[PDB]
Amino acid sequence: DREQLLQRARLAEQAERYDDMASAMKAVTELNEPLSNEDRNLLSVAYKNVVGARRSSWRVISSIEQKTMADGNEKKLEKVKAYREKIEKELETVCNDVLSLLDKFLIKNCNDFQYESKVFYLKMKGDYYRYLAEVASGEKKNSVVEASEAAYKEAFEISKEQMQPTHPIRLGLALNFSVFYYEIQNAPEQACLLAKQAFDDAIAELDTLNEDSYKDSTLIMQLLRDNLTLWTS
Protein backbone atom coordinates (compact mmCIF):
# COMPACT_ATOMS: atom_id res chain seq x y z
CA ASP A 1 0.00 0.00 0.00
CA ARG A 2 1.34 3.43 -1.02
CA GLU A 3 0.17 5.52 1.90
CA GLN A 4 1.69 2.91 4.26
CA LEU A 5 5.08 2.77 2.50
CA LEU A 6 5.24 6.61 2.27
CA GLN A 7 4.34 7.18 5.93
CA ARG A 8 7.10 4.75 6.82
CA ALA A 9 9.59 6.72 4.67
CA ARG A 10 8.72 9.99 6.42
CA LEU A 11 9.22 8.46 9.89
CA ALA A 12 12.36 6.59 8.86
CA GLU A 13 13.74 9.94 7.63
CA GLN A 14 13.08 11.65 11.00
CA ALA A 15 14.74 8.71 12.77
CA GLU A 16 17.69 8.75 10.36
CA ARG A 17 17.07 5.13 9.51
CA TYR A 18 17.98 5.60 5.85
CA ASP A 19 18.07 1.91 4.81
CA ASP A 20 14.49 1.67 6.03
CA MET A 21 13.66 4.82 4.07
CA ALA A 22 15.31 3.57 0.86
CA SER A 23 13.54 0.19 1.09
CA ALA A 24 10.14 1.92 1.54
CA MET A 25 10.71 4.26 -1.46
CA LYS A 26 12.03 1.43 -3.69
CA ALA A 27 8.69 -0.26 -3.01
CA VAL A 28 6.69 2.92 -3.71
CA THR A 29 8.59 3.21 -6.98
CA GLU A 30 7.86 -0.49 -7.82
CA LEU A 31 4.12 0.21 -7.81
CA ASN A 32 4.77 1.70 -11.34
CA GLU A 33 2.86 4.92 -10.64
CA PRO A 34 4.45 8.40 -10.93
CA LEU A 35 6.19 10.17 -8.05
CA SER A 36 5.12 13.62 -6.88
CA ASN A 37 7.73 16.22 -6.02
CA GLU A 38 7.59 15.27 -2.39
CA ASP A 39 7.98 11.51 -3.24
CA ARG A 40 10.91 12.09 -5.55
CA ASN A 41 12.82 13.95 -2.96
CA LEU A 42 12.12 11.23 -0.39
CA LEU A 43 13.66 8.69 -2.76
CA SER A 44 16.60 10.98 -3.46
CA VAL A 45 17.26 11.68 0.21
CA ALA A 46 17.02 7.99 1.21
CA TYR A 47 19.45 6.86 -1.37
CA LYS A 48 21.83 9.84 -1.06
CA ASN A 49 22.31 8.89 2.61
CA VAL A 50 22.58 5.14 2.00
CA VAL A 51 25.23 5.56 -0.75
CA GLY A 52 26.94 8.49 0.99
CA ALA A 53 27.67 6.25 4.02
CA ARG A 54 29.31 3.68 1.73
CA ARG A 55 31.22 6.43 -0.11
CA SER A 56 32.53 7.86 3.14
CA SER A 57 33.54 4.37 4.38
CA TRP A 58 35.15 3.60 1.02
CA ARG A 59 37.35 6.73 1.12
CA VAL A 60 38.59 6.08 4.67
CA ILE A 61 39.58 2.45 4.00
CA SER A 62 41.19 3.45 0.64
CA SER A 63 43.44 5.90 2.54
CA ILE A 64 44.47 3.13 4.96
CA GLU A 65 45.17 0.72 2.04
CA GLN A 66 47.45 3.34 0.40
CA LYS A 67 49.39 3.80 3.69
CA THR A 68 49.62 -0.01 4.16
CA MET A 69 51.05 -0.34 0.60
CA ALA A 70 53.84 2.19 1.38
CA ASP A 71 54.45 0.70 4.83
CA GLY A 72 54.94 -2.57 2.88
CA ASN A 73 52.83 -4.72 5.23
CA GLU A 74 51.64 -7.45 2.80
CA LYS A 75 49.55 -9.46 5.34
CA LYS A 76 47.51 -6.43 6.48
CA LEU A 77 47.27 -4.96 3.03
CA GLU A 78 45.61 -8.28 2.10
CA LYS A 79 43.00 -7.65 4.80
CA VAL A 80 42.44 -3.91 4.03
CA LYS A 81 42.08 -4.65 0.27
CA ALA A 82 39.42 -7.29 1.01
CA TYR A 83 37.41 -4.88 3.31
CA ARG A 84 37.59 -2.04 0.81
CA GLU A 85 36.30 -4.53 -1.73
CA LYS A 86 33.42 -5.64 0.63
CA ILE A 87 32.41 -1.93 0.88
CA GLU A 88 32.72 -1.44 -2.95
CA LYS A 89 30.38 -4.31 -3.66
CA GLU A 90 27.98 -2.75 -1.14
CA LEU A 91 28.28 0.63 -2.84
CA GLU A 92 27.91 -0.81 -6.34
CA THR A 93 24.75 -2.68 -5.27
CA VAL A 94 23.05 0.46 -3.96
CA CYS A 95 23.97 2.34 -7.19
CA ASN A 96 22.65 -0.43 -9.44
CA ASP A 97 19.47 -0.67 -7.37
CA VAL A 98 18.93 3.06 -7.89
CA LEU A 99 19.87 2.85 -11.58
CA SER A 100 17.42 -0.03 -12.09
CA LEU A 101 14.59 1.97 -10.43
CA LEU A 102 15.42 4.84 -12.82
CA ASP A 103 15.73 2.70 -15.97
CA LYS A 104 12.86 0.34 -15.27
CA PHE A 105 10.23 2.71 -13.79
CA LEU A 106 11.07 6.39 -13.34
CA ILE A 107 12.70 7.51 -16.62
CA LYS A 108 10.78 4.78 -18.54
CA ASN A 109 7.35 6.14 -17.50
CA CYS A 110 8.15 9.84 -18.17
CA ASN A 111 5.88 11.56 -20.81
CA ASP A 112 7.62 13.36 -23.63
CA PHE A 113 6.15 16.36 -21.64
CA GLN A 114 7.07 15.66 -17.97
CA TYR A 115 10.31 17.60 -18.37
CA GLU A 116 10.88 18.42 -14.69
CA SER A 117 10.70 14.70 -13.78
CA LYS A 118 13.02 13.70 -16.67
CA VAL A 119 15.70 16.18 -15.76
CA PHE A 120 15.44 15.13 -12.09
CA TYR A 121 15.80 11.45 -12.96
CA LEU A 122 18.50 11.81 -15.59
CA LYS A 123 20.45 13.91 -13.15
CA MET A 124 20.03 11.05 -10.72
CA LYS A 125 21.32 8.55 -13.36
CA GLY A 126 24.37 10.78 -13.84
CA ASP A 127 24.94 10.93 -10.08
CA TYR A 128 24.88 7.19 -9.49
CA TYR A 129 26.92 6.35 -12.54
CA ARG A 130 29.34 8.94 -11.14
CA TYR A 131 29.40 7.23 -7.78
CA LEU A 132 30.13 3.94 -9.58
CA ALA A 133 32.89 5.80 -11.47
CA GLU A 134 34.51 6.92 -8.17
CA VAL A 135 35.40 3.31 -7.43
CA ALA A 136 35.54 1.67 -10.92
CA SER A 137 38.61 0.38 -12.77
CA GLY A 138 39.63 -0.21 -16.41
CA GLU A 139 36.93 -0.90 -19.04
CA LYS A 140 34.20 -0.94 -16.41
CA LYS A 141 35.30 2.61 -15.47
CA ASN A 142 35.12 3.73 -19.09
CA SER A 143 31.59 2.46 -19.45
CA VAL A 144 30.22 4.07 -16.28
CA VAL A 145 32.06 7.37 -17.01
CA GLU A 146 30.44 7.50 -20.45
CA ALA A 147 27.10 6.49 -18.94
CA SER A 148 27.39 9.29 -16.38
CA GLU A 149 28.26 11.88 -19.00
CA ALA A 150 25.48 10.82 -21.42
CA ALA A 151 22.76 11.09 -18.70
CA TYR A 152 24.06 14.46 -17.44
CA LYS A 153 24.24 15.74 -21.02
CA GLU A 154 20.65 14.73 -21.88
CA ALA A 155 19.37 16.08 -18.56
CA PHE A 156 21.09 19.44 -19.16
CA GLU A 157 19.80 19.90 -22.74
CA ILE A 158 16.18 19.30 -21.69
CA SER A 159 16.68 21.70 -18.78
CA LYS A 160 17.92 24.44 -21.09
CA GLU A 161 14.91 23.79 -23.38
CA GLN A 162 12.29 23.69 -20.65
CA MET A 163 13.52 25.28 -17.37
CA GLN A 164 14.39 28.75 -16.26
CA PRO A 165 18.13 29.16 -15.39
CA THR A 166 17.17 29.90 -11.74
CA HIS A 167 15.28 26.61 -11.43
CA PRO A 168 16.88 24.72 -8.45
CA ILE A 169 16.88 21.42 -10.31
CA ARG A 170 18.63 22.86 -13.37
CA LEU A 171 21.11 24.66 -11.05
CA GLY A 172 21.96 21.50 -9.03
CA LEU A 173 22.36 19.50 -12.18
CA ALA A 174 24.82 22.18 -13.38
CA LEU A 175 26.57 21.89 -10.05
CA ASN A 176 26.94 18.06 -10.20
CA PHE A 177 27.71 18.05 -13.93
CA SER A 178 30.61 20.48 -13.27
CA VAL A 179 31.86 18.35 -10.33
CA PHE A 180 31.79 15.30 -12.64
CA TYR A 181 34.06 17.12 -15.11
CA TYR A 182 36.40 18.31 -12.38
CA GLU A 183 36.81 15.12 -10.36
CA ILE A 184 35.79 12.32 -12.71
CA GLN A 185 37.21 13.62 -16.00
CA ASN A 186 40.04 15.69 -14.48
CA ALA A 187 38.94 18.44 -16.83
CA PRO A 188 39.13 21.60 -14.60
CA GLU A 189 38.60 24.16 -17.45
CA GLN A 190 35.56 22.34 -18.83
CA ALA A 191 34.22 22.07 -15.24
CA CYS A 192 34.80 25.77 -14.57
CA LEU A 193 33.17 26.88 -17.83
CA LEU A 194 29.93 24.94 -17.34
CA ALA A 195 29.72 26.12 -13.69
CA LYS A 196 30.38 29.76 -14.70
CA GLN A 197 27.78 29.65 -17.49
CA ALA A 198 25.16 28.34 -15.06
CA PHE A 199 25.85 31.04 -12.45
CA ASP A 200 25.91 33.59 -15.24
CA ASP A 201 22.64 32.47 -16.86
CA ALA A 202 20.89 32.55 -13.44
CA ILE A 203 22.10 36.04 -12.64
CA ALA A 204 21.01 37.31 -16.07
CA GLU A 205 17.50 36.15 -15.09
CA LEU A 206 16.96 36.86 -11.39
CA ASP A 207 13.54 38.12 -12.51
CA THR A 208 12.59 34.40 -12.76
CA LEU A 209 13.01 33.57 -9.03
CA ASN A 210 9.77 32.21 -7.52
CA GLU A 211 8.38 32.52 -4.01
CA ASP A 212 8.63 28.83 -3.26
CA SER A 213 12.15 28.20 -4.58
CA TYR A 214 14.22 31.48 -4.33
CA LYS A 215 16.15 30.29 -1.24
CA ASP A 216 17.21 27.01 -2.86
CA SER A 217 18.11 28.78 -6.09
CA THR A 218 20.34 31.28 -4.24
CA LEU A 219 21.89 28.53 -2.06
CA ILE A 220 22.94 26.59 -5.16
CA MET A 221 24.18 29.67 -7.02
CA GLN A 222 26.51 30.18 -4.01
CA LEU A 223 27.68 26.53 -4.15
CA LEU A 224 28.53 27.03 -7.84
CA ARG A 225 30.46 30.12 -6.89
CA ASP A 226 32.20 28.26 -4.00
CA ASN A 227 33.48 25.59 -6.37
CA LEU A 228 34.69 28.10 -8.96
CA THR A 229 36.71 29.95 -6.28
CA LEU A 230 38.31 26.70 -5.06
CA TRP A 231 38.94 25.56 -8.64
CA THR A 232 40.25 28.82 -10.13
CA SER A 233 42.60 29.33 -7.11
Binding site: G172, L175, N176, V179, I220, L223
Partner: peptide, 4 residues
Protein backbone atom coordinates in the same frame (compact mmCIF):
# COMPACT_ATOMS: atom_id res chain seq x y z
CA UNK B 1 31.03 20.03 -3.23
CA UNK B 2 28.14 18.36 -5.08
CA UNK B 3 24.52 19.10 -4.33
CA UNK B 4 23.56 18.28 -0.72
Amino acid sequence: ISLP
